[PDB]
Amino acid sequence: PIVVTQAHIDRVGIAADLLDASPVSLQVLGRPTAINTVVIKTYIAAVMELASKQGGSLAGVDIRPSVLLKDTAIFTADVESDVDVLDTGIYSVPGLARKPVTHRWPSEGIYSGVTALMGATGSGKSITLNEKLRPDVLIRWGEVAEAYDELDTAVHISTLDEMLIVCIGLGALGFNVAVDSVRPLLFRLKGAASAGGIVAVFYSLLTDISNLFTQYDCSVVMVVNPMVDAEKIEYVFGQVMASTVGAILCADGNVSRTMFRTNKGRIFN
Amino acid sequence: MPIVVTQAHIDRVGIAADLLDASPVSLQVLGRPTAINTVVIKTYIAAVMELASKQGGSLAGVDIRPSVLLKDTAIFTADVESDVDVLDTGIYSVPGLARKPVTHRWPSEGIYSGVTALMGATGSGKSITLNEKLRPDVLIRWGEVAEAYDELDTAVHISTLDEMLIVCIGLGALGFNVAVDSVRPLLFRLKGAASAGGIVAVFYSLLTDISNLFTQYDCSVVMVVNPMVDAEKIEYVFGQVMASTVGAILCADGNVSRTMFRTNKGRIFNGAAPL
Amino acid sequence: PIVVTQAHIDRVGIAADLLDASPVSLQVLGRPTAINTVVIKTYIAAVMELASKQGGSLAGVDIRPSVLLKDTAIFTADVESDVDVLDTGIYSVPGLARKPVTHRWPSEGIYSGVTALMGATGSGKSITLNEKLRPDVLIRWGEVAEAYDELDTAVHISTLDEMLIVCIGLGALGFNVAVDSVRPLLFRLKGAASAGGIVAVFYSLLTDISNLFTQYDCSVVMVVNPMVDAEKIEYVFGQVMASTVGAILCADGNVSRTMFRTNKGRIFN
Amino acid sequence: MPIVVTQAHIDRVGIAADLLDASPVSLQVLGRPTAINTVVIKTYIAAVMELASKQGGSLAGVDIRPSVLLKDTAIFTDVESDVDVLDTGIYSVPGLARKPVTHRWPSEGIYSGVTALMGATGSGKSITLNEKLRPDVLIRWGEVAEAYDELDTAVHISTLDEMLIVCIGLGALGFNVAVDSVRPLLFRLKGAASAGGIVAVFYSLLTDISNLFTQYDCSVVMVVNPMVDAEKIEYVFGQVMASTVGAILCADGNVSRTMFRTNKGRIFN
Amino acid sequence: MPIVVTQAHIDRVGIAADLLDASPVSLQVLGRPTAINTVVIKTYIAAVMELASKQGGSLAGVDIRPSVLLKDTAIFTADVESDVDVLDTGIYSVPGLARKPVTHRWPSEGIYSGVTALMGATGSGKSITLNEKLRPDVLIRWGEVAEAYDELDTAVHISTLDEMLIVCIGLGALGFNVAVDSVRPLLFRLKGAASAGGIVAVFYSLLTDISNLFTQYDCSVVMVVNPMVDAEKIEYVFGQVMASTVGAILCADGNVSRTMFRTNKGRIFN
Amino acid sequence: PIVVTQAHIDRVGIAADLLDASPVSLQVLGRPTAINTVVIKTYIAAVMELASKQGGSLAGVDIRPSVLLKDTAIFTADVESDVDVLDTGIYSVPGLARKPVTHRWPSEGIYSGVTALMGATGSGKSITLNEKLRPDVLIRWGEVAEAYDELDTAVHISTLDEMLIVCIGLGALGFNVAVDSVRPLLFRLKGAASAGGIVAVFYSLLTDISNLFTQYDCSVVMVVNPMVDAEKIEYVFGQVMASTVGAILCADGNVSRTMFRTNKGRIFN
Ligand SMILES: Nc1ncnc2c1ncn2[C@@H]1O[C@H](COP(=O)(O)OP(=O)(O)O)[C@@H](O)[C@H]1O
Ligand SMILES: Nc1ncnc2c1ncn2[C@@H]1O[C@H](COP(=O)(O)OP(=O)(O)O)[C@@H](O)[C@H]1O
Ligand SMILES: Nc1ncnc2c1ncn2[C@@H]1O[C@H](COP(=O)(O)OP(=O)(O)O)[C@@H](O)[C@H]1O
Ligand SMILES: Nc1ncnc2c1ncn2[C@@H]1O[C@H](COP(=O)(O)OP(=O)(O)O)[C@@H](O)[C@H]1O
Ligand SMILES: Nc1ncnc2c1ncn2[C@@H]1O[C@H](COP(=O)(O)OP(=O)(O)O)[C@@H](O)[C@H]1O
Ligand SMILES: Nc1ncnc2c1ncn2[C@@H]1O[C@H](COP(=O)(O)OP(=O)(O)O)[C@@H](O)[C@H]1O
Ligand SMILES: [Ca+2]
Ligand SMILES: [Ca+2]
Ligand SMILES: [Ca+2]
Ligand SMILES: [Ca+2]
Ligand SMILES: [Ca+2]
Ligand SMILES: [Ca+2]
């Protein structure tokens, strides 16, 4: 189940302070788009109210944003992916001047941010995620019908707005949030593929997503499976390590390589 | 050759209407998420049942084509380019099922509701395997040249993607074993930059979105997917398709080279089961 | 000459019925465009009236649509080849539920549809067509001045609309229509080249053209010459076999391979 | 060096006007078909004859340039190169149903149309043209300052409209017109390169240009030098032979291969 | 860790304002040339000096971020595509200096004003070399994940390209040793057809335009440049970057592989 | 210094004449754009007045167009580089019917036009330019801070308009003008790369620039260093020789190959 501890209730105020304190945006190949912080706060309030009506034990089905919120929009006419960078400007989510909040998951003493669970198709990413990682909240998005969908920890979303709402909203409260998968975004990345058979803005997006979680004290594990050649996966994994707080590589059902940025330092395997 | 409507199908009509009304769905490709008008599918089911009633249960595939039964065949309800910022359009994937999906005996025993993808190079024996080994109840024929399968009473000739989804969701929800030969009109018009495997990445997302659309409406559909891909990259593309569908079949030299089915007994790779 | 028999005159009514019975469209990389059936009927009536001015014998020059019709348009603001496929929709010309009408040309018992005469430049396609196939009507499009242009069977067109008018119009009446060449269309096909150095929509167009002829009981032979590498022609020919009712490959002035879908079944060489 | 107007040229003026008025023509590349204003070519012929009358018939190439004789040099009366082929339509200039008028230049008994003077850079194309071919009128387009520019046969143009005006205008009258070179058109041909490292519409354009000259009884030699690999030139030359009435290949200052479509048939070397 | 304002910096304030007003500048990429609003940089300098006055000259990088000091962070003053005719937009390159550039002691002795590119593969030791071996006065952090360098009092966290240029031109002109870790948010968003070396040609033009912008405002800036390039193609790109920057440093296996600096004693290669 | 001789003063009238006599344009992948000749004349007049105020000895800094002219625009809504060639038309600057004016620089008896100083990065182009070629006026564009910027011959420009103003303006008067570099124009050439890893319109632009100088009796040396592979430079230099009046190849700090079109003929090394 998804259980709401006193620790989560005590974080509600802090989560609001974090969201209000820093105005954030996101950019991909178009123009920077602001994130409406209010929506995330509204989601937290709705989750806590429902957790209250229950015995602290919540069902992932009941906490999906489409059910709790009237509108699921986070981003507040239309720009092409091939527009001059000087006409749109460039935005990256700012870093944290203070020391980031540490976590015990996915690794001991890991800083707040994003962890990328990498590997070829059928390498055992989903298996590693649910058996070895054991997340508190499992966001299921753009994945086919599996055994993980019947889990009470599973929260089924449709949009990128919904993913960020659940990730920032619940992650800030202290929950160990995971996403299986981020394929709907990755498989719709438009642009000229750079070195490694993948668009360069992919690495910028991982950093922007990681810093978004670092700023809101979230520890999120994302399954990242982009369309890349069997031999080019090693290069891409190395590049992703330079763009995320955590990185896990899967091969033949087992964990091939690891990287975690902890309070004890950067740890490689 | 005929399409027979059992009491089991008649009893599913209400259930199907509820499934459609219960969840609002959309679809996206490289542009803006587009809503699916559920009403049209319900209207199609009502028209099929009414005609099944006039005839003696038994129906001809020719008579159940949407262009004949419905005044308008539109399912999707100004114009966006395939190269527009992903943040200005947002991203949509059809949501998964929180409950256990309805199991089926076709195309494999104890299979979950969703989509099965019948892969293979040209002349690998996809259409042969589909009609001889699989034996579907309803055969949707789309963007295929004149073959023996067109003279079959199970054959329903469509022209649009809207029509394909109407027949697939409409009849599939009622319990019919629906098949699509081919899905090529869609595949050959996929605009975008080709990813690893000489095919657009959104192709795999579309298969998952189509699979979940059928999982939500308790459909068991087999779609024959013919990719414009090099002889050596077909193995990679299949491996990728397996991770995007409830069922996958590879064809090579008139036979079935590889299979994958997500059953109630678990995920089965290359089983000892004749189709 | 192009001789009009009583058999052709008796088909006029049936041709009009076939055209009115089914509304058709066509699509390439843009949006589906409807085919104005009326124009084809008007062309048939004009050919029959001229046939009547002569002794049933017609000169190919006199039956060109630009001469017989006030407007040659068949397709009834502007869409790019890289627009969302969900905004335009997808269209394929529907198949025939009934048995297709059989023909004696280009092969015995062949079903109505299209035959693709393939081969490298100077492989003998035009020679094979005019000497071995010997068509009743020879549509000449996008080909330089040759001996075939002085033939009374030759009808010189300029547009794709004109090609379909003569192909559907005369083909429905029972004439053995041939197109040399379909290069104006092929060489202007915009889009990213798929496996085999050719746009994938090329194979969809051949199927849509074939089914358009199957629906109107036409037996047409089109010279399909692709800008493809000398060794990649075998792959493309195999791909075309899956998209047409007939397929003929030319090499060194001789017929290399054949494929025909007949009443006796699919025949390979 | 001078351009002399014979009685034979004066007697062709009426016929030339009759050929231009008889058939309405257009041209297409990757966009939409654009009509050719025939009147402008007639106006040019009348201006050349009027000047030939004032002088002794001995005209200077400098004095017969369209920019000097005509107030407006436009022959064609905004669409992207990546637009749906069904929204623009397809156009190819129609073939001649009658036998084409034969010429003694560039080869004996050659049919009216276009001849492509091919070869690598510095293979001796310009040398072969002026020394071995000896053209009556030498159109100079997109070429650096050479000895051929000081010639009284040289007519310096700037636009494609001007090229067609001088080619059709003077060529119809019986003059042996040559173009060195067609490089500004070829190097501005936008689109995805097909087999041989060159856009497929290049071969369609050569056929459309050839048929335009076949219809107006012109015998034109165009030096065609597209950006192609040193070893891929043999493939491209073979493909061009299937798209033109004449084809000449240059290597090490000499003529490597030749192809001409004559009244005695197609002659290869 | 702190950012100290010397009398030398205070004496440069007037000169900096003169340099900015004297020459109107612009920037171009694949679109149309866009003017740089000089006033914003002057306003930033005034805000930094006023805060340095309230403190004891000792400033925290966090307090000097433009988003905190300025109401509006825009430097560039409807929308053009990256594939538009070059003749319809025109071409702009920031002009060179007719006079001798103002030399510095950092990143190398007697190096002319401009930009230095800190190159290398991912995890080659660029960030390590920057903070340990280079020791910058001001460390601009942009498009980089949470690291130890973010807790430094020299660290100034930006979000936009406008902010980067404000801090680089503003503080660099006063004489500060400014560094950017990194410029990945601009590089990874560079739209266009990749030229020889698996990278867009306008990348080299941008480095020269950025270099000259610093040369004109007597700025000594070190930018870590890490574009998506193949493991073996990095040598070619580094050689090409040397022809586009005043300084160039290559990193390999945590150490400095190669160097290039344009100094008063001449161009020095390793 | 930049010294103004009586020979330069005597050319002022001839320069205005040459400029008024022929209206010119320029085209790249868009539409042809006219060059305002008046601006070049205005620049010449401002340079001569300043030369007359000073001792004839000028400073490159004082003759920059941005300082002498109120507006630096030469070209007089927005077209994409992928637009139909038939909708924009094609323009090439016309050739000279008369003999081009000869020069003693960069080679003896060389015709007026452009010389391309080619080579890989650090091949010695800028060293060869300033030590071996010794230009009168040195235009500095798109280059980092070097020793050449402190020179009194150096004139710092920002736009393509400014480059043409100084090149045509001072070049017509008899000055030996050089551009280091033309990289801001080369590196911003949008379009599909042809054979040799470079856009085909690059060669057309060199010919158009050369002919622009041939028409205005200029002798200009431009260092041309486009992004091309280390082994593909030989092919490109070969194509450039067919597009310019002069061509110099640099390697290992010295001159590898040369080509000059002189009054004594074309000289190769
Ligand atoms: N092609 C295959 N053949 C056999 N077993 C496979 C195949 N693909 C996947 N599997 C099995 O599935 C497991 C991986 O499951 P899963 O976690 O869902 O992979 P992923 O999330 O990386 O796509 C493997 O460890 C293996 O047991
Ligand atoms: N090139 C060929 N030569 C011979 N037989 C062929 C050829 N292509 C296909 N076939 C035959 O057709 C069968 C496949 O038919 P079909 O099911 O329609 O293929 P698909 O649907 O995959 O295109 C093969 O098993 C074989 O008997
Ligand atoms: N380059 C060539 N050299 C010699 N003969 C050739 C050449 N190209 C074609 N031919 C001749 O022309 C014949 C083919 O003519 P044709 O039917 O017009 O070819 P296609 O229509 O395929 O282009 C060949 O069989 C051969 O006799
Ligand atoms: N790189 C070169 N080295 C030596 N001679 C050359 C070179 N390029 C051209 N030539 C000379 O120029 C002649 C070709 O001149 P030209 O007719 O103008 O060629 P093209 O028009 O094909 O470019 C050759 O026969 C040769 O004598
Ligand atoms: N894949 C790796 N395996 C082991 N150590 C690594 C790896 N990647 C980076 N490192 C360590 O990190 C150091 C580089 O850190 P850093 O300066 O942040 O690199 P960069 O800024 O170039 O990405 C290396 O010297 C090494 O000690
Ligand atoms: N990578 C390098 N390593 C060493 N010296 C170099 C390098 N690149 C250039 N040089 C030096 O600079 C000289 C070339 O200078 P320059 O003319 O400015 O080059 P460019 O051709 O880029 O204009 C060479 O002769 C050599 O002394
Ligand atoms: Ca998975
Ligand atoms: Ca089939
Ligand atoms: Ca032929
Ligand atoms: Ca030449
Ligand atoms: Ca770093
Ligand atoms: Ca240099």
Numbering used by the authors:
A (entry chain A), C (entry chain K), F (entry chain I): 2 to 77, 84 to 276
B (entry chain L): 1 to 77, 84 to 281
D (entry chain J): 1 to 77, 85 to 276
E (entry chain B): 1 to 77, 84 to 276
Quote the passages of the study that discuss this structure, keeping the authors' original sentences.
We use bacteriophage φ6, a member of the Cystoviridae family, as a model system to study the assembly of a complicated multi-shelled virus. The inner T=1 shell, composed of protein P1, forms a dodecahedral polymerase complex (PC) harbouring the three viral dsRNA segments (S, M, and L), the viral polymerase P2, the hexameric packaging protein P4, and the assembly cofactor P7. The expanded PC is covered by a layer of P8, forming the outer T=13 shell. Here we present the structure of φ6 NC to near-atomic resolution using electron cryomicroscopy and single particle analysis.
The six-fold symmetry of the P4 hexamer and five-fold symmetry of the icosahedral vertex beneath creates a symmetry mismatch, so that the structure of P4 cannot be resolved using conventional icosahedral reconstruction. To address this we applied the localized reconstruction method to P4 hexamers. Local areas corresponding to P4 hexamers were extracted from the NC images and reconstructed as single particles with six-fold symmetry (‘P4 hexamer reconstruction') or without any symmetry (‘NC vertex reconstruction'). This allowed a low-resolution structure of the P4 hexamer to be determined in situ. Our localized reconstruction of P4 hexamers that correctly dealt with the symmetry mismatch revealed elongated densities extending from 3 of the 6 P4 C-terminal parts. We hypothesised that these may correspond to the C-terminal parts that are disordered in the crystal structure. The sixth, unbound C-terminal region of P4 was not resolved in any of the reconstructions, and is likely to be either disordered or unresolved in our maps due to limited resolution of the localized reconstructions. Binding of up to five of the six flexible C-terminal tails of P4 provides an elegant solution to the symmetry mismatch.
